[PDB]
Write a sequence for this structure.
């Protein structure tokens, strides 16, 4: 029992938002439909389908297609595997297992976590949206560059969430901003 | 760019608590002092110190010793590595890399995440304490057993945190997931 094995360290960051004027169920209807992320981050994602396993069950793989970055550029594609799903607890975990999404496909073993929590009713309710990622250090990136890839997308997704919820963007507050 | 590599799924769960009556900095002074977890979960941990790397810097390993879990039994020991740290953002990640801590040492690649967030000053303040874990599925365990091992420890740790902060136990509220 007096021995240990060193492991590599990770890059990453976790973010949390408070969302008012909605419920965990309404947010989850959009955010929790993992294989239909095209119905969530619709400003970036053109379409999305399950390509392995059963839709939204642990182990399944989604393939989604992103709109071109500019006129002459091609659409890009993501493959990501649901590696944990707990719908009852409004939380899941996924990782990129293929594709060529700009920035994201550069990272080594990008793994992301989403968790929704309800604030107590007597405090006016609202939802805490937790979203984190990690990636393994590799020579072609830095942690800072990973954060510069991830955080603007998370930000866009929170804005797209509001659009689908028909609530104002001001409904969302990034905690510790 | 149209193929993917399937991976195994994970076990785990994420929990969030609201903590009132304190500040994120006070909480962090206890929770974020990774190598002195004996100053936090004092009802379980007898002693703790860094045994590899620089204290509370990513890559470091702490060794801590726990009191006999029940009478008759012997002390147990944990070795865990800090695999991510962002002190200014009040979040870190660690994993067990050795030892024989009851329950926790049975899991394969136990990885845990702690993240503190401030609720808006505007809406009354308070701290959100996020704590999650994953483990790799293994034949000698079940995910249910993992949760039965982990959750009571997290719960005890939040109680001990209140003791050290000199705030009532009523300060902590587990959020509905
Ligand atoms: O399935 C949700 C989940 C999220 C974060 C974790 O750390 C573990 C599980
Ligand atoms: O966090 C995963 C993710 C990455 C890129 C997207 O377009 C959508 C989700
Ligand atoms: O807005 C405060 C509030 C108090 C008690 C409730 O049940 C709901 C809201
Ligand atoms: O989350 C890991 C952990 C386990 C036992 C402890 O006593 C403290 C932390
Ligand atoms: O008994 C083994 C041992 C190793 C490192 C320590 O810091 C303490 C004990
Ligand atoms: O628990 C989160 C986690 C992140 C990256 C991994 O490689 C494994 C687990």
């Amino acid at each position: 029992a007096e021995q240990f094995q060193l492991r590599g360290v990770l890059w990453g960051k976790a973010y949390s938002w408070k969302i008012t004027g909605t419920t965990i169920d309404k947010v989850w209807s959009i955010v929790g439909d993992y294989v239909r992320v095209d119905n969530w981050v619709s400003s970036v994602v053109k379409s999305s389908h399950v390509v392995s396993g059963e839709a939204n069950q642990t182990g399944c793989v989604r393939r989604f297609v992103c709109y071109p970055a500019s006129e002459g550029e091609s659409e890009t594609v993501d493959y990501s595997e649901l590696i944990h799903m707990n719908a009852a607890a409004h939380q899941y975990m996924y990782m990129i297992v293929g594709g060529n999404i700009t920035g994201f496909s550069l990272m080594k073993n990008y793994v992301s976590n989403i968790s929704l929590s309800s604030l107590p009713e007597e405090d006016g309710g609202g939802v805490i949206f937790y979203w984190s990622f990690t990636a393994e250090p590799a020579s072609n990136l830095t942690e800072q560059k990973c954060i510069e890839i991830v955080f603007p997308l998370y930000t866009t997704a929170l804005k797209d969430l509001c659009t689908h919820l028909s609530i104002p963007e001001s409904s969302v507050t990034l905690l510790d901003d």
Q: What stands out?
A: Chain A touches chain B through 56 residues (CB under 8 Å). Residues 1-177 of chain A form a domain with the Alpha-D-Glucose-1,6-Bisphosphate; Chain A, domain 4 fold (CATH 3.30.530.20).
